[PDB]
Amino acid sequence: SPKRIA
Amino acid sequence: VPRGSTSEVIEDEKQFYSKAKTYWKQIPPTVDGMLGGYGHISSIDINSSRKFLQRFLREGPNKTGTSCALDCGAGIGRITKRLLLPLFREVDMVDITEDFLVQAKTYLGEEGKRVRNYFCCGLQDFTPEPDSYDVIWIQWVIGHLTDQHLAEFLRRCKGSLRPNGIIVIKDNMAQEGVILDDVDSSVCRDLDVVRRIICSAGLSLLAEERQENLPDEIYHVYSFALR
Numbered sequence: 103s104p105k106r107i108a
Numbered sequence: 109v110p111r112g113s114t115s116e117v118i119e120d121e122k123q124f125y126s127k128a129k130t131y132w133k134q135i136p137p138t139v140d141g142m143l144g145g146y147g148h149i150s151s152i153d154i155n156s157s158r159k160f161l162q163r164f165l166r167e168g169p170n171k172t173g174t175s176c177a178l179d180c181g182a183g184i185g186r187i188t189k190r191l192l193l194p195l196f197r198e199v200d201m202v203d204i205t206e207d208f209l210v211q212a213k214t215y216l217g218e219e220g221k222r223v224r225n226y227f228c229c230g231l232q233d234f235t236p237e238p239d240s241y242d243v244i245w246i247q248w249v250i251g252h253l254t255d256q257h258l259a260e261f262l263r264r265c266k267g268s269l270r271p272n273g274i275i276v277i278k279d280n281m282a283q284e285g286v287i288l289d290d291v292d293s294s295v296c297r298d299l300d301v302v303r304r305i306i307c308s309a310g311l312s313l314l315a316e317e318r319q320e321n322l323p324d325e326i327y328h329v330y331s332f333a334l335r
């Protein structure tokens with residue numbers, strides 16, 4: 103999915 | 109320093125796939141589920157995808173047809189509903205998660221009667237019919253394939269295109285390298301890596317576009333149109 107930059 | 113291939117980041121290929129299958133089996137069959145808590149961005153995404161695709165639908169020698177599209181990693185059919193069914197006479201869906209394809213029959217409503225095949229298969233195991241699709245749409249799923257499997261899937265997709273057909277990839281891109289997410293069991297690759305893979309599959313870029321108006325905190329998203 104679209105997701106927060108780790 | 110940066111990793112350039114999945115073979116540097118995946119400890120065990122069978123577990124890479126099996127963990128991803130388990131992860132998606134426990135995601136709700138909803139737009140917010142498909143979008144990882146970002147269900148609210150769906151309209152921004154679809155509007156941009158539509159404009160991107162319409163580039164290729166103009167009259168002329170290379171006009172992409174409108175008979176059939178294939179939605180890859182389709183989930184419940186978010187893209188099939190809002191982007192593809194309106195533009196293509198029929199659509200096929202492929203996804204690994206049976207529960208999502210079952211939910212799709214509800215989610216898609218009456219227009220879903222024009223979904224022809226619902227294929228429940230991993231992309232790594234799927235061979236689309238030759239000379240069948242005007243558009244093959246691959247969104248928010250390439251990170252679930254190894255580089256070898258992604259290159260091979262793209263080769264099989266090439267063989268499935270109708271005259272003037274295109275493949276579209278739309279996905280998360282890393283600033284640099286190849287980054288493992290061990291919770292959903294996927295990778296995020298930089299633009300150089302993705303372009304390498306596309307080239308390896310015997311495909312060429314027609315267009316590349318960054319998605320605008322996304323939350324600042326998330327990976328950048330790009331679209332590629334290929335033939």
Ligand SMILES: Nc1ncnc2c1ncn2[C@@H]1O[C@H](CSCC[C@H](N)C(=O)O)[C@@H](O)[C@H]1O
Nearest residue numbers: 132142181183186204205230231247248252
């Ligand atoms: N190896 C694989 N082959 C096919 N589908 C896969 C897969 N790994 C994950 N998936 C599917 O990939 C989807 C990611 S969520 C994104 C769904 C859809 N592309 C959209 O943008 O709305 C889920 O439906 C999940 O079941």
